[PDB]
């Protein structure tokens, strides 16, 4: 399915009071680059503190490759680098 | 996902438009956009595509038409220059070639 149609995923920034939470479709025929593909999210979520580093399902279980994101999780904690 | 296409309408031959679509999510710098036209009751032919590197035309608007992009606004734009009767049909943005807008007529008399 993830090679019939581009996948959307939600995407919610840790942190800020009201939580950022959004929605960002990626497609797995063009999707190369894990670090792209954080630095592409990090801009579609406005992180002003750098490019994003950790990413977490909402079970807690972090992402740390394209795969993570075509699995079975569509939603995503993104922690921006001023949390740690 | 929904697109939302605007911009469209008369211009005389020579004239310019821009054309615009706006997706309902946000998009990133990895979506692919494109622009078909549409002749009545005729498949649509790809006019223009933009993904991360590189920007593609038909060989009949490459230098007129422009395709280009603002990630912030969740959108694509077409600016047409120099429009030719040639160019009159219902143009359609797509993304990732699989989310469509509804049409937008342009007629250049």
């Given amino acids: ?84 | 996902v929904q697109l939302q296409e605007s911009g469209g309408g008369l211009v005389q031959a020579g004239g310019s438009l821009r054309l615009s679509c706006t997706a309902s999510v946000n998009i990133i710098g990895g979506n692919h956009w494109a622009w078909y036209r549409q002749a009545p009751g005729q498949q649509r032919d790809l006019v223009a595509s933009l993904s991360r590197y590189n920007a593609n035309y038909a060989d009949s608007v490459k230098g007129r038409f422009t395709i280009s992009r603002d990630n912030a606004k969740n959108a694509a734009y077409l600016q047409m220059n120099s429009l030719k009767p040639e160019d009159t049909a219902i143009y359609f943005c797509a993304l990732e070639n699989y989310y469509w807008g509804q049409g937008t007529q342009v007629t250049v008399s």
Avoid: M, W
Avoid at chain 1, 12 to 33: D, E, F, M, Q, Y
Avoid at chain 1, 63 to 72: A, M, P, S, W, Y
């Fill in chain 1, 1 to 84: 399915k993830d090679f019939v149609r581009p996948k959307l995923v939600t995407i919610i920034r840790s942190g800020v009071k009201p939580r950022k939470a959004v929605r960002v479709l990626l497609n797995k025929k063009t999707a190369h680059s894990f670090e792209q593909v954080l630095t592409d999210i990090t801009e579609a979520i406005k992180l002003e503190t750098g490019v994003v580093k950790k990413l977490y399902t909402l079970d807690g279980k972090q992402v740390t490759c394209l795969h993570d994101f075509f699995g079975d999780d569509d939603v995503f904690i993104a922690c921006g680098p001023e949390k740690f």
